[PDB]
Write a protein that binds this ligand. Structure first.
Ligand SMILES: CC[C@@]1(O)C(=O)OCc2c1cc1n(c2=O)Cc2cc3c(CN(C)C)c(O)ccc3nc2-1
Length: 1195
């Protein structure tokens, strides 16, 4: 075994404590870990073994189902597989529940000793030590041996999950093409990504389905023997809490899906902002999108906050549920007239303290997780019952072949086809079009079957689809594609593929790892690899579907004239290519149409504290948190004082020889119950409000930072990187972190409850508390330095599994062509177990930590129990019963406290990323001092003086010293080399980066006005037109300052009015995604309509009409020159004929003004680049251009 696994040989008292895992933490404390530091899985965890074993039952089970004439049952099959195993772990669950319930009874007798106390009876004292001893071992069961057990219940989960990933993939290769036609990859990948993943989460709780109810019965029976019928009072109320928890579960799922619509509506609208940002800014339409995102968020926040109230009240039930069921029990019990006594109260408090989790949380969860598992199985069953291809599947013969992609009602995909070919001969095929162009090959592969006629083949087939496909590994590994390596074969074919030079020049040699999803190769080179793979296999049958042979290249000739015509030509081969002239070398040509063989037409026939501060300060004044800190303690102190008051009552009562004032004691006691639920519920609402209001603020402080971010921000940051923060992180700050934080705080108080009660009742506990503390601090620090990293490795090692299935599910034909399932199965198993190696660490890592938290927690109970008995002269029965009833309660809650601590610390990083967006360097203000006068653009005069511009500070100067005059209403065409200068002068004109030099517009220096004062007052028509998901009215005027008449005129200025007024909303029609119902030219016509609405005296055309039919461009040209006669127009355009009649042209290259004059005068200088560019037209049209330019003198 490559990575020997210590679990093979660790002794019991190693693996009980996971002591064997110690070396991992040592190294993980010294280093960052890597995939070689993780252990290999034990033999039985191998995907192949589990799958082959489970098939060994599911196979039998479908045999039964056919023989019994019923639909089969996968749930029975896994059960029949795991029954003989999984029952054994039930035995520990049984003894575990016993320990949970037995502890109270002996907590009775150890308290009972104090009720009978005399300092001088050693015999009674020794009995108490025996009870205290068994109380320790009972704790030791729950606190130590529980952890090995829980790991094995987790292993039932992981073992079951892995086996399904095997059987699914095994099915996926056997899957019939029809079933693949009835399927999408996303279904199988999701099934593997999620729906099998549920099998861990059922198995942790499946034993609670019986052990929980059996627990509840036992607790009621015991209590009845302690407190009579009165135990029915609490237990019935406890059981009523079970539906009530479900009632909350129902509601927020409703409101969660109700909020889903708005995060989707927000995130789509946000994605338009982030991707569209540049053109958004030029229009000055921030305020439009600012209103949308604000209103959706303010809508979203209202429902998520209204859900947050119910989510808060839910935890308040978990806070009061012990206190309510205690109160009603003893109140009834007292009203049936019993005195209250320390022994009989704390037993019930402890029995309730034990059962409460089982009925209120584990069992409610379990019935849900079982329900999600059983639905997961039934779809997996559905998948495993899809149809399959017939798995059995020197010469090739075909005869009258009549076949379909599916037996739909249309005519067969192949019809009447017959041929035979023998080795040493090449067929070629003019195949179908609009359909399976290589359908003939697909028949030879047996992807299709005859309704009539026959195909017969012998030997082994090589195939390539015209679609390329590349396997996970190196390119050499793809050239091997699992076959043995053979240097001379490999050399000869790889050289005959001319691949070495390209592979050396472009892909670093054959050792190059093929990257994620095949990223590494160019598609042109990727295509050739398929043939290189094919030829390396030296198969009997070589089937070629157009390998971009249609692409003219020396290799696409060389492969044929040397390799395919001479080397490969000995083998059986069939070729489809557009290279019809290659088929002059073909031995035979088949031409096909409508599946018919139409002719044998042979060719000759032709995180630091500051994060917390920032997050909380964003919620409220610190004065509010002071009010909040009061409520926390008030809830917690009300909680403890209730149980202390119950002790105090018992202590007074047992002192009497005479009546108690029932309505004093029960009065105050009832008060603390009402108080503890009321502060508890109030606290639980307040925390959410403070934190959720904090999330709302961070979004709005952050969202404004995004609109006012300069374009430079969106150059450096990918769209996904930004948009993820608006989906994921602010998702968490609404969905889950306020919840997780309140649950952390709630539990932390309760731990502070037990510890502080314990030191109060027994002061000298305060000494050993500090050792336990410092032990915990070093433990947490030592642990999390590793666990943080294992979770990284686990999350990483997941991604090859889905990638491999996706790649393999894309390659199905090819895999079965090489009948290579026997290996590709092994590749999946290699990936699956390597993830399982990480999952095995993830399970056992947490236990090695969790067992110590329960170790030091187990040590605490010892301290209180024997500490109480040591101080027996001083303590008194009520106070001990308080201390011990709390001490037992620590066991469960303390582990949960630190789990949420780790999860909050991890999740809190989402807040750091959000705040890092709250302070991005802004542009200058939109509105600024020295506002331009009320009609400032009144001439369209522009000066550029020594203008210098860059896409980054200190970057390359893409404008150098650019200096120009543009006169009023002048029409300035601009052109240059492709990619030279480009829009940079436009982005300078919008100040999207601040230019050096000066730009003056209508006597105003552009660098001394607000960016909306500028950008509102100049139109642009962009390189790519943009529509926004919204009304046609908003896409034309979000401010609705233009009349519908003007909006109709604009749509009537273009052709499109009578294509929009017939849409049901008319101007108010909101569009499909990206306006798919409109053509690209029509989207530019929308920008022209926008421009026609704006009627600014300045317009910029950015090369737009290259997307558009010239006849629509002709309309654009017409309407520009008609409508913008008074306007000043700048026009970057590639084809000079669009601009040949400009009053002047600027030509830019290398960032310099190569030319600026009347275009004919530029042509009149035969040295000019403009003349040269017109001469580079290479055509007599240069004369028509020249004449048209000269006419500008005279027309
Ligand atoms: C749901 C997770 C889990 O089942 C688990 O994976 O392992 C076992 C375990 C769990 C949860 C909780 N606990 C556990 O031991 C203890 C616990 C206490 C909780 C408390 C405090 N209790 C004293 C009521 C809460 O307020 C809210 C949620 C709580 N959840 C849990």
């Amino acid at each position: 075994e490559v990575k020997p696994n210590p679990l093979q040989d660790a002794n019991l008292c190693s693996r009980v404590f996971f002591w064997w895992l110690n070396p991992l933490f040592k190294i993980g404390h010294k280093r960052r870990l890597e995939e070689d530091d993780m252990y290999s899985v034990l033999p039985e965890d191998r995907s192949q073994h589990l799958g082959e074993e489970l098939q060994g039952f599911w196979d039998k089970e479908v045999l039964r189902a056919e023989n019994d004439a019923q639909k089969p049952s996968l749930t029975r099959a896994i059960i029949k597989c795991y029954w003989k195993s999984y029952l054994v772990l039930g035995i520990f669950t049984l003894i575990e529940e016993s320990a949970k319930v037995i502890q109270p009874i002996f907590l009775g007798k150890i308290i009972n000793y104090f009720e009978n106390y005399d300092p001088m009876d050693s015999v009674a004292l020794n009995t108490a030590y025996a009870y205290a001893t068994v109380l320790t071992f009972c704790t030791l069961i729950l606190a130590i041996l529980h952890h090995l057990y829980f790991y094995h219940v987790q292993c039932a989960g992981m073992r079951l999950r892995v086996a399904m990933c095997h059987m699914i993939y095994r099915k996926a290769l056997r899957l019939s093409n029809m079933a693949m036609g009835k399927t999408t990859t996303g279904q199988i990948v999701n099934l593997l990504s999620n729906d099998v993943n549920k099998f861990d989460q059922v198995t942790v709780f499946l034993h609670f389905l019986w052990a929980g109810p059996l627990q509840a019965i036992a607790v009621t029976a015991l209590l009845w023997m302690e407190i009579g019928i009165s135990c029915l009072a609490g237990m019935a109320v406890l059981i009523i809490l079970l539906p009530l928890q479900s009632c909350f579960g129902k509601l927020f799922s409703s409101l969660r899906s109700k909020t889903a619509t708005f995060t989707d509506a927000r995130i789509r609208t946000m994605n338009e902002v982030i991707t569209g940002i540049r053109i958004i800014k030029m229009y000055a339409w921030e305020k439009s999108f600012s209103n949308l995102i604000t209103n959706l968020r303010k809508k979203e926040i209202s429902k998520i906050l209204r859900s947050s109230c119910l989510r808060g009240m839910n935890l308040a039930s978990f806070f009061s549920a012990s206190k309510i069921i205690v109160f009603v029990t003893f109140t009834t019990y007292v009203l049936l007239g019993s005195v209250i006594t320390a022994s009989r109260v704390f037993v019930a408090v402890t029995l309730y303290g034990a059962v409460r989790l089982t009925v209120t949380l584990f069992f409610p969860s379990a019935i849900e997780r079982v329900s999600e598992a059983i639905v997961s199985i039934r779809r997996i069953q559905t998948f495993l019952l899809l149809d399959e291809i017939s798995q059995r599947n020197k010469m090739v013969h075909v005869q009258d072949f009549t076949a379909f992609w599916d037996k739909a009602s249309e005519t067969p995909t192949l019809q009447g086809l017959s041929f035979t070919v023998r080795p040493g001969e090449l067929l070629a095929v003019v195949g179908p079009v609009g359909a399976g162009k290589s359908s003939l090959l697909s028949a030879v592969l047996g992807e299709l079957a005859p309704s009539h006629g026959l195909v017969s083949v012998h030997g082994r087939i090589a195939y390539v689809s015209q679609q390329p496909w590349v396997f996970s590994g190196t390119l050499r590994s793809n050239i091997l594609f699992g076959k043995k390596y053979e240097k001379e074969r490999y050399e000869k074919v790889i050289k005959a593929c001319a691949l070495k030079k390209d592979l050396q020049l472009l892909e670093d040699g054959d050792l190059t790892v093929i990257g994620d999803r095949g990223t590494t190769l160019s598609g042109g080179q990727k295509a050739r690899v398929n043939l290189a793979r094919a030829v390396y296999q030296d198969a009997d049958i070589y089937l070629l579907d157009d390998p971009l042979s249609a692409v003219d290249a020396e290799v696409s000739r060389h492969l044929f004239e040397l390799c395919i015509c001479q080397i490969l030509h000995e083998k059986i081969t069939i070729l489809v290519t557009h290279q019809l002239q290659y088929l002059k070398a073909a031995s035979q040509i088949l031409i096909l149409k409508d599946g018919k063989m139409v002719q044998k037409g042979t060719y000759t026939e032709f995180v630091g504290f500051q994060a917390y501060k920032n997050y909380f300060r964003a919620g409220a004044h610190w004065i509010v948190f002071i009010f909040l800190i009061l409520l926390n303690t008030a809830a917690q102190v009300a909680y403890v004082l209730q149980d202390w008051w119950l002790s105090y009552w018992a202590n007074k009562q047992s002192m009497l020889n005479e009546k108690l004032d029932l309505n004093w004691y029960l009065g105050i006691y009832s008060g603390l119950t009402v108080a503890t639920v009321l502060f508890g519920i109030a606290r639980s609402l307040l925390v959410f409000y403070v934190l959720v209001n904090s999330s709302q603020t961070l979004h709005n402080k952050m969202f404004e930072s995004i609109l006012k971010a300069p374009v430079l921000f969106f150059d450096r940051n990918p769209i996904g990187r930004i948009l993820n923060r608006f989906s994921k992180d602010i998702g968490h700050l609404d969905d889950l972190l306020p919840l997780t934080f309140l649950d952390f705080i709630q539990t932390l108080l309760q731990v502070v409850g037990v510890v502080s009660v314990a030191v109060a009742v027994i002061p000298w506990i305060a000494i050993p508390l500090v050792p336990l503390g410092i032990i915990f601090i070093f433990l947490r620090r030592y642990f999390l330095e590793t666990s943080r990293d294992v979770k990284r490795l686990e999350s990483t090692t997941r991604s090859p599994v889905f990638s491999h299935l996706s790649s393999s599910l894309q390659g199905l034909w090819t895999i079965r062509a090489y009948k290579a399932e026997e290996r590709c199965q092994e590749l999946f198993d290699a990936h699956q177990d390597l993830h399982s190696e990480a999952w095995f660490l993830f399970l056992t890592t947490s236990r090695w930590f969790a067992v110590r938290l329960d170790a030091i927690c187990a040590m605490f109970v010892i301290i209180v129990a024997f500490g109480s008995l040591i101080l027996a002269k001083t303590l008194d029965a009520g106070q001990v019963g308080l201390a011990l009833s709390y001490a037992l309660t620590l066991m469960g809650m303390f582990q949960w406290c630190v789990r949420q601590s780790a999860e909050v610390e991890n999740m809190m990083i989402s807040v750091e990323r959000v705040i890092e967006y709250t302070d991005l360097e802004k542009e200058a203000p939109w509105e600024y001092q020295k506002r331009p006068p009320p009609a400032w653009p009144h001439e369209g005069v522009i000066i550029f003086d020594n203008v210098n511009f860059m896409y980054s500070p200190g970057g390359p100067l893409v404008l150098k010293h650019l200096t120009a005059l543009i006169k009023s209403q002048e029409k300035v065409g601009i052109v240059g080399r492709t990619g030279a200068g480009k829009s940079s002068l436009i982005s300078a004109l919008f100040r999207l980066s601040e230019p050096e030099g000066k730009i003056w517009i209508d006597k105003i220096l552009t660098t001394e006005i607000g960016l909306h004062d500028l950008r509102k007052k100049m139109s642009i028509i962009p390189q790519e037109p943009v529509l926004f998901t919204g009304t046609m009215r908003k896409n034309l005027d979000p401010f609705n300052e233009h009349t519908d008449e003007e909006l109709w005129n604009a749509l009537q200025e273009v052709q499109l009015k009578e294509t929009i007024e017939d849409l049901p909303g008319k101007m108010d029609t909101e569009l499909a995604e990206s306006g798919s119902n409109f053509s690209v030219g029509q989207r530019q016509l929308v920008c022209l309509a926008r421009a026609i609405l704006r009627k600014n005296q300045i317009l910029i055309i950015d090369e737009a009409t290259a997307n558009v039919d010239p006849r629509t461009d002709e309309l654009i040209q017409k309407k520009i020159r008609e409508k913008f006669a008074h306007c000043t127009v700048l026009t970057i355009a590639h084809r000079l004929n669009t601009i040949i009649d400009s009053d002047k042209i600027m030509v830019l290259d290398s960032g310099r003004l190569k030319e600026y004059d009347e275009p004919y005068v530029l042509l009149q200088n035969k040295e000019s680049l403009f003349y040269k560019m017109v001469q580079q037209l290479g055509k007599a049209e240069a004369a028509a251009l020249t004449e048209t330019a000269k006419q500008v003198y005279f027309k």
